[PDB]
């Protein structure tokens, strides 16, 4: 319905400008401070090292930036592997899920080329498995609810409301198992704050996958089973979450 | 069938182990290239500037890292959180692309981002479905003229349906995969392969962030910055439709 389509366009377009205003107002001040700190660091270095021109230091910094950007670590001079078998497994998963954290980048042209086909074939394959698991999990959940639903029907609360309350229990546990449980897990395991962990979980299950936070990626932890196993969580959550994302969609269409 | 999905799980897993082996074999031998480059930069600097100790340069590099980590950029209009870039960043969310080349630093930023997405993604999905339908219509409608030609040529109506799909995607591909990749090559001084990698990583909504095109506007070519936003919208729609139908073919199978 062309009218509706343009209305929707204007709407979203406003949802974005709205987002923009908020993130600017919330993040720009931190950013301008950092830009200031960098310049302070340069100026301090010049005053200490008269054998260095501002312009030369500038190049040093550009070169250092490029290397850190490529995943160099400031702390050391040079063991653990980003591409070790467990981590590579994990990396692939990030593709077919479309999450795409990207905390570790491909460097080889061959890597990029293979990645293209790996995804084109991998994502639809995964989508199908996901639909499958979504149906199967909902079924298991629905059968489970039925037994407690039987108790509500005896208590003479209407079949219409009993169904609604069950939803509340239904998601609340789902959320408990897939949102709340993991966030509590991650806080303790990754040294994140409550809020960081929830941020991570949600960024993950929406498949946004910023990559600022990645469970397991931490170099120090000797926890091999953990990170793929987390992927096991990711499978459940993503399915449970997909069920939800369509539904907030329905509510949105209704208004 | 539950048995069948369990079988499907194993298939995937093998698809993952298979992927793992390839990336490991392809990338492990370059894990440490960036360190090596950093060290080279240090050692070169020391040789040029005898008034600097390794340890002092070390701190410089830590302090620089902290600042870049906060969003600073090397100087020699760069604001990632000015209006235009924040708009773009919000887009990366509702699309679920999530490049992440710019991170949120504030806890408030993270908190707001959660709700922004929960409400934003479904809202965008709906607009996307809408645009997918409207665009598919324009496409299929155009193809209609060629379909008329095939029907005259007494090509079976069933194959005519197939050729139209091939066209349907092939024409999109030209406009949405091939055209942009050629565009970006020239604009971003990326290689042919880098550009395709980018395009596809983007339209699959994987959004690694190693390559990003539309974050800031380009003086001397104004149309660039929006055209990309427009492109992403259409491309995402064209890609979704492929997936739903290839998904569509897949689920019955």
């Amino acid at each position, epitope marked *: 319905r062309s009218t509706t389509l343009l209305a929707l366009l204007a709407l979203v377009l406003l949802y974005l400008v709205s987002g923009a205003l908020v993130f600017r107002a919330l993040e720009q001040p931190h950013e301008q401070q950092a830009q200031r700190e960098l*310049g*302070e660091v340069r*100026e301090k270095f*010049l*005053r200490a090292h*008269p*054998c*260095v*021109s*501002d*312009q*030369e230091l*500038g190049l040093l910094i550009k070169e250092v930036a490029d290397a850190l950007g490529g995943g160099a670590d400031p702390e050391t001079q040079s063991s653990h592997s980003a591409w070790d078998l467990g981590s590579a497994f994990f990396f692939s998963g990030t593709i077919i899920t479309t999450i795409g954290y990207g905390n570790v980048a491909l460097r080889t042209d061959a890597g990029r080329l293979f990645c293209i086909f790996y995804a084109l074939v991998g994502i639809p394959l995964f989508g199908i498995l996901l639909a499958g698991v979504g149906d199967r999990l909902g079924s298991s959940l629905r059968h489970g609810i039925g037994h407690i639903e039987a108790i509500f029907l005896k208590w003479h609360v209407p079949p219409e409301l009993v169904r609604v309350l069950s939803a509340m229990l239904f998601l609340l546990i789902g959320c408990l198992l897939f949102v709340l449980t993991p966030t509590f897990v991650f806080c303790y395991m990754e040294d994140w704050s409550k809020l960081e962990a929830i941020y991570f979980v949600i960024v993950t299950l929406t498949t946004v996958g910023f990559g600022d936070y990645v469970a397991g990626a931490d170099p120090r932890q000797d926890s091999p089973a953990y990170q793929p196993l987390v992927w096991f969580w990711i499978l459940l959550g993503l399915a449970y979450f997909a069920s939800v994302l369509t539904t907030i969609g329905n509510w949105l269409r209704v208004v | 069938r539950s048995t069948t999905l369990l079988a499907l799980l194993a298939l995937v897993l093998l698809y993952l182990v298979s992927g793992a082996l390839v990336f490991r074999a392809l990338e492990q031998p370059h894990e440490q290239q960036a360190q090596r480059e950093l060290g080279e930069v240090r050692e070169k600097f020391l040789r*040029a*500037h*005898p*008034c600097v100790s390794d340890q002092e340069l070390g701190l410089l590099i830590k302090e620089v890292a902290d600042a870049l980590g906060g969003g600073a950029d090397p*100087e*020699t209009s760069h604001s990632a959180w000015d209006l235009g870039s924040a708009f773009f960043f919000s887009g990366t969310i509702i699309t679920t692309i999530g490049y992440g080349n710019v991170a949120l630093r504030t806890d408030a930023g993270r908190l707001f981002c959660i709700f922004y997405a929960l409400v934003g993604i479904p809202l965008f999905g709906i607009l996307l479905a809408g645009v997918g339908d409207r665009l598919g219509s324009s496409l299929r409608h155009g193809i209609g003229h060629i379909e008329a030609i095939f029907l005259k040529w007494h090509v079976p109506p069933e194959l005519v349906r197939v050729l139209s799909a091939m066209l349907f995607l092939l024409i999109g591909c030209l406009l949405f995969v091939l055209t942009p990749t050629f565009v970006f090559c020239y604009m971003e001084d990326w290689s042919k392969l880098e550009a395709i990698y980018f395009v596809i990583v983007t339209l699959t909504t994987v959004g690694f962030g190693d390559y990003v095109a539309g974050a800031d506007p380009r003086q001397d070519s104004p149309a660039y910055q929006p055209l990309v936003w427009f492109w992403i919208l259409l491309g995402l729609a064209y890609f979704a439709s492929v997936l739903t139908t290839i998904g569509n073919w897949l689920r019955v199978v």
Partner: antibody
Amino acid sequence: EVQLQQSGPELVKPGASMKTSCKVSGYSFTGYIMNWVKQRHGKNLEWIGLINPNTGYTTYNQKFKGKATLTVDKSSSTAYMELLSLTSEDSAIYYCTRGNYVFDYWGQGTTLTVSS
Amino acid sequence: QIVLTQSPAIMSASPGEKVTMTCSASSSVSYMHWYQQKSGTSPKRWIYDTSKLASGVPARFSGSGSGTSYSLTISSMEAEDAATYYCQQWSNSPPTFGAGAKLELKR
């Protein structure tokens, strides 16, 4: 007592080029950045560019990118500036001064006259 | 290409008077430096890093400021203070200069 001693006034024809020098004493030539500055009869000061005597590195004010070449002789701890295809607009006083953030020591200046 | 404005370009002071000359920057700057020039001779570093006094300089001189606004002050004018004063910046390359402020003796 740091000192930058510049060579004497120079007179050249329009179209010619010119080279002028600045010897340093009282400190280590290769330890500090050298700059040149133009002052056209008693008016604003204009930074021409710098050279790092130790590394050979140079950068120039965009205004002077084509016009001026900076070099150094490490052994005699002397800095040089060459100016090219001179016009009457180039007649001015030119200083060498030292520094990477403030210009802490200056030569006494040298006057360039461009004339027929 | 930060631009430094010194206004007014000319001023005069009787001996004993307090003198203040200012430098506004087109965009923020972390430190300002000042040079004294007497006609016939090269500029001398006078004040650097906003408020540090160079070796020779008498204490009647001071400097202050921040961000985009900086100033040089003489608590009590003297005769040998007649000169041109220039501000300069190097928080961004290329370094740049104000166009000078000429300070003559009143009489």
